[model samples]
Target chain A: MKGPAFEFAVAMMKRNASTVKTEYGEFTMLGIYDRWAVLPRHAKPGPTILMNDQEVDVVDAKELVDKDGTNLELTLLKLNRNEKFRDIRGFLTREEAEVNEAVLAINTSKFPNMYIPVGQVTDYGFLNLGGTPTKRMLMYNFPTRAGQCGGVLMSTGKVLGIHVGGNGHQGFSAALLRHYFND
Target chain B: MKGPAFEFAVAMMKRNASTVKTEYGEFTMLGIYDRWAVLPRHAKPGPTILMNDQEVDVVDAKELVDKDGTNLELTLLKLNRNEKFRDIRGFLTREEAEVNEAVLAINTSKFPNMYIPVGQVTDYGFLNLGGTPTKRMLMYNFPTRAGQCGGVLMSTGKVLGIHVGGNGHQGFSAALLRHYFN
Candidate 1:
């Protein structure tokens, strides 16, 4: 059954997804916002971007803090050497994702090949990651594992969010990404 | 977006599903195999069958031991008094559920109304639930909570399994159910 989900899964694996190797650990990266590759904030910079074990050209790295005061942190890597990437198609706001809506969490790091893990939107609210309270945190029922922190959280082929570290496979809303990229 | 999933969810709620209140705790029950209401095995017999808090006629209760020695336990409650129930339409074997295939866990006990929790088939193999090792066990990635034991685990419109209590929302395959009822 090659439906919208099938297409999204293939496109994500072949083009828009990669692995980010950091000094701290490995995380997934997605080609988004034109020439930028995004991942969860790493402990340090100078992460190596790789696809299928071959290094992709990366020119710069910057950690972004949500201007709206949400405790979401995303590290943006600038792809250089004339690299081309297809950013995610669109975004699904937290409001649009009503409770029980079907969502998929795609982690290139989990399985040998990219496997689409399906889950449902369980909640959206504030959370305390460490001691700081954050807003726009998304909670889904998927059993997310380590090294899958930066994977894509999507619904019906649209980017809903990026999986974040914490309890219950939480995520940071894609609306934050839309605001940062101004798209 | 109303398709097979929508129809299945509605039919499961309005017709084939109910709650079983046991001496231990509350669990969900599904009307299956004509006159049988299936639920997880309780600590004792004589569970009060409920539908929206109203009592349903349950004449007998029996705890089934898997003839195949899978260590799976399910309680079958015989509904009499001319009660009618539509059993789940079909079944999906453990072999049929490939890894990462989308599935749903419907629990009437979790939310105020019945809410469908989506997950993916993670693994299928032997698991040691307590001391005894069991086979034909299914693992999915859904965050199943307490009191959601015996909820339906389904894919598309077919019954894949029934949610069992353990780490990571394990399940017992419907093929085991088919074997026991046979």
Candidate 2:
């Protein structure tokens, strides 16, 4: 119990089972105010997030396991954090990791076509989505088209962010891969 | 045939009518190089435009009459029109009609919530979505949320433009009410 999970474990466990359940699963909330919760082991970034029938290109998600055997999943996508959406809101961002030279944007539309090349970050921090983040997003220069929101933006197969549309500008929120869970 | 449509009428009229049929019905291809097709009186704003099941808030729309008893409609809503989208690319912009004080943004989402106030045009004139404006868009300042793209914006019942989503900026295309059709 050293990092954030430990901290989360500590904050959520004030008594009893010494455990906390997240959408990720039940963790025997261990240690002190910096306890760590163990996942169900079969955890993986999956099932994808959908907003208004549209699949949200998920950068990362946190599943809170409830006693009802259900998972309360929270996702981080490419949309700006301050904006309010149907149900999904941006909740996390990254600071340590920055963007690379040329990011590959895979279109989230019905048919898969050529990948779009995107540029650098324009705006970083904004209390936009009503969700949470380091609360940062990097705006880039890329050509956008209709129905291309929630696409995956990757660099060398590793996800950098999710593609949110822009007319003259392009952007994605940094993935909070390191913030929520550990391998 | 006069005015912009007239110019179009004169051009299209000089052609062949043998093989032209719109869903509404068939019309003999009229005369020439630049052709203009006019709509009958029943034209009006749409029921709405929907993108992937979401209704596109049409600030305005025109229903072209097809003898087949169908209405071919074209609508304008707020959406970010930058350079490149799907197959259509955007180009051209206008300077004169910039944004004003506080603009009323009508939310075309699942329901009509409170009206959002927006301001300023971020970038003017980029080869974005391939469409017709007065050939211009007046951007404004507005706090936008995700999926709020294609919202129609107005001021005291008068249309300003459609709401194209932006990170820090806001904008809408000019309402080509009388200019494009009629």
Candidate 3:
């Protein structure tokens, strides 16, 4: 399957920019992929992050620095809250290699037991993993309670230019992929 | 212009198709220019519907009419109250040609009032009566209000579509054009 390949990198924040003003305080945005097509497609799921060619599960995205200056190290607190987190993971810059399990733990208020976001899709979308075409439109798929709803990409994240993913194959989640990949 | 000269008509409710469902009900858009772009060079004070067109001033945008079966001759009771009727002018497709009057009235909302809307401009436009671009854009020569800020295109008897007339045109009122010509 053919798809447009592009440039991507992750950068950490040294300090919050003092002058920058908006609703949220100043911080850094780690560039994951820019110039990626606005379309959609798929790739492998869960801890999509590839560090030193090792697959680290139980994390999605990350910030720039760790509590103490360090390299890649998974924070133990998160695993203590729920052992289930041993599974979620994704790519981060070298400095933020340390995974915060809390980031993977669900925030009930921010995300209730289940809800459908505006820009995601139904009917498991894991078939196009790895080579799924993500070329047009920025969207999201979310997981809702009934287990019926997959995932949703709410709009607030994009006001500051965050990509939850989009239509087509790349929009598929790792959980959705695992549901299929395991079989 | 170097601008768009739009003209097409798509039914809000198409007769056939299942992608989007339609509810059963009677409806009519009564199309007209809903917004415009107003360039400072071309934008004059405006068409004040109340001064010359009393009939137009009486018809507020949100009014509903319940005429007891008078066909073209039937006059319905206007739903808007007296104070609310001060702003709106005649039916967009009627006899009074208050386009300029309407434009002036819109301008006054930005000028005379202390509360001006620095929000997204909408569908409405005006001819560059002619001036330097800077005098228009950078000079703050134009201002728009937040609420009740809309424009229109008009024919002899009615409004055609809302237009984008001045400096701060409504950002998302594109549907105004789609409503009229498209």
Candidate 4:
């Protein structure tokens, strides 16, 4: 969803529900697996917040009874007090988590300063959750308060996609929305 | 529902009903929007396909009611037969798609036959979709009887994703499951 949209949405029925459901969270239960994902469900729907052992569905995602359920941290982006997905979860794959470390190393080393690409998709789960200071991109006026501003993504250090902005659709990651080191 | 399990099901509560649901059919309806999607529950899930003004969901996508849906075609890979991702769709922007094609042409123009780069994530949809029939690496091998064998989409278009085999991934995709073509 970063910069492209897949052409087809092949819908097939399966008898096995387990295949679609994943038990990812340890505390509260959520529809991390069963919920259908909406297209471009935010660049790499943050988790770091994986509720169940599956992908996040921001579409149907809303405040649950769980404390973390309200955790904006669960997602990589930050929303206003009332903002929510207002849709259903689409694209159900870890691939939706657009970030890749290899994309990081490369992006970090190359533009390190000039045009830094920032998003949860590039943070590589361990890099931030490990308690280490998360990385940032000093790309001019970054973290634009403009909301879901587009930038770029680097997985394992390769530019996965250049979030197309000027229209809308930027990396609307929960991770990038909060914690502004410069903020 | 292939090899890896999703995490959302825990919150899902499946309803039980018995009355002999209508027969079903398998067909994909492209979102009139950028890449919206939906199906009839009768198509797969319960007994009604989910379709809003802009989107539709195939409730029970596995079965075909009376072929009253979109006719089957090679492009409609799923309808013609049972394939992975019969209910999945991709979402990318128009600019990205065009940009990818432009870049791909430049990168592979020389080697045309050799390992094509396929470029970055932006190019993924088209690259994987095999926009051109014989021109696509995987679709090159796609024939009806040839059915469709799952293959990992290599970055360099080299070998398949690695030990990737079996149920594929609808999981990964069904219609575009054809191996990389030359």
Candidate 5:
């Protein structure tokens, strides 16, 4: 009763993170079992505050402070939705996710790479969000109907990073996880 | 790896099994690298026999002898279309697939059984077939848009059975892999 999946089991056991239903589909919340895992979406400085709903432990960024601040908060949330997360392992440093780092993707498509085994198996995968602007992310060979967005990137049995969304390979002066966690 | 999938990966590496596209859909053939893995579909004894297609090393009941005989062969092939082939492991000893055998299904629907993390992943599989009554047999659950006639069932890193088709669950029997490759 063991393997890579076992690690996943162990992670679940330690309660590192859990899935929550957010406006952006199912996403994982950090700071569950380990505070290092709590890499929030690196959002810009705005008026509205994004609060975690401790009830079921989900995200509730819909709360606003005042009328004068509502517009900027709304604007920020919109801008931040695309790059909304971090590589759990990388962001553990209380810092930001730097670009050009190695990230692995477990690509399991219906037109399967037969080489990968059947049942929860995936072809060897490694996908950095954008090495070539709009080239690879153009079609996003990974459609992922099963909520794979917030999953971790594992390499050498080590979590390399988190799978934040593809933001047109934006050249943001301050990346999502970087903006908040860094400063 | 080092799990059920690793075994599947190794099985593929030995060139033992590969997915084949048929009118029904995708299926795997055994005994490619290892002869022990080749277990063909067990058809009831009938004339104009059923044989594995040796062409691309695939299923080939199509290569028979004459016009009168050829027509029946074609007829049988068409008739036998429901229950395609197998993966050698399940059908090996010619016995029943025992139930309550701690079978693992990946359970990846909107609902997931996140706890069980061992062995190879079946993603919740159970299949059966039905066409021509006793002709097709039945039981089907795990289905594919393209056909998923002959997949494999594994236990403890060993391929314990082959998914022929649903016996009575054609709708129920057509449940892919439901026949308990136990």
Candidate 6:
């Protein structure tokens, strides 16, 4: 029998993902853990966490940087409560992100979520977003829109990464969450 | 056991797909049948079939228009020989192009082929390119570049459709191949 269909992951994303509106522009925010969400650093959250129809309090903000001073260009948002989220199944390890594994890049910046499928993982490498230090990221072959940064990348219902930014398809590996969050 | 991996489809595409150079611009061409290839009608056709490093003879060209006058916006090129292709598995019936099936949009317009994965089929509907009649097509969520027109849309190694043109993602169903090419 087939394991949970991709819809399972899509449904999970629909429940936990939200649009983030900041002073700069709009982006995607993924609620990967209870009371916690992650968005692109460029978004630079406003005073509050802006959802499509609601606003949640931002208790704290953490810049996800590595020990080597590589800026991952992602910001973790500590929310006031877990009211808007459901239980996340978990994350996919970097080891699990094999080349050619099918993945979904879910962008919630718009009302109806944009679920873009990445045909396969093209490679694992680093990207230097000009001004910032380079950080490790996962690359795929599909096209992604501008405001889709901070979107969630899923495979087989598990979170694999957070879209950082790219010509169209690139994201920070979810493995960093284990190293930084450790919770 | 796992049937052929996605690479199987990729390899098949790398072998049969090519970039079409026309007066307008470059587009892609997919050799679905031995010595028979298809491309976006907009690309039209040049004096010959332009490959990356070589050129092939284009014996005849046919515009894939439907009975109701809906322009499919596709052109089929009958090549002079069967030299450059391997046998294509077959086309996927409309029934098989289900909602969540993983698909690859292979574009050989560039050196390193672009294999874009359409997350899934968003919907099956009609698209009316201005100035032309409406035609049935498949829609996907991923982004696609301009020159990718005439590329191959595949699922499990079977031809599903031809990339017509969309804001980012959309293509004409392969089912039309049966009706028109018939």
In terms of DockQ, the best-performing candidate is 5
Query: Chain A of model 6, TM-score against the native?
Result: 0.81
Q: Provide TM-scores for the models.
A: 0.48, 0.26, 0.20, 0.20, 0.39, 0.63
Q: Across residues A59-88, which tens digit of lDDT does each residue of candidate 5 receive? A: 223322233432111111222222233334
Ranking by TM-score: 6, 1, 5, 2, 3, 4
All DockQ scores = 0.04, 0.01, 0.02, 0.02, 0.11, 0.07
By lDDT, who's the top model here? 6
- What tens digits encode model 5's per-residue C-alpha lDDT throughout B1-182? 22343334343323444333344333443332121222224322222222333223222333222333311111112222333334444323333223221122221222111111122232223222222222211222322222332444433434444344432223211112212233
List model 2's recovered fraction of native interface contacts, to 2 decimals. Answer: 0.00
- In candidate 4, what are the lDDT values of residues B1-182, reduced to their tens digit? 11001111100101100011113422223221122222222223332432212222233233211134431112211211122221212221212121121111000111111111122222222222223211112222111111111211222121112111112212112222221110
| Candidate 4 local lDDT, A105-140, one digit each (tens) | 101111111112232444232222123222222121
Error of 5 at A68 (Å): 29
Candidate 5 or 4, higher DockQ:
5
RMSD of each: 8.8, 20.9, 20.7, 20.2, 12.4, 6.4
- Chain B TM-score, model 2, reads 0.38
Q: Which of the two candidates, 2 or 4, achieves a greater lDDT against the reference?
A: 2
Worst 10 residues of 3 chain A by lDDT: A1-10
- Rank candidates, lDDT, best first: 6, 1, 2, 5, 4, 3
Quote the lDDT for B107 in model 5. Answer: 16
- What would the per-residue lDDT of candidate 2 be over residues B1-182, giving only the tens digit for each residue? 00222122112212211122223322121111122222111222243323323433333233432355332222322222232222100111122234343333222222122123343443343323334222334455543444433333333223333343344334443332333322
Per-residue lDDT of model 6, residues A3-111, tens digit only = 1323444565657776667767777677766677777777788668567657767888987777887777778788887474564635545343544455444444231
Every candidate's fraction of true contacts kept comes to 0.00, 0.00, 0.00, 0.00, 0.06, 0.00
Model 1 chain A: worst 10 consecutive residues (lDDT sum): A108-117
* Minimal lDDT window, size 10, model 1 chain B: B109-118
lDDT of 2 by residue, A114-157 (tens): 12335344445442442432343545664354444433443332
What's model 3's lDDT at B55?
25
Predictions in order: lDDT: 0.54, 0.31, 0.19, 0.21, 0.29, 0.59
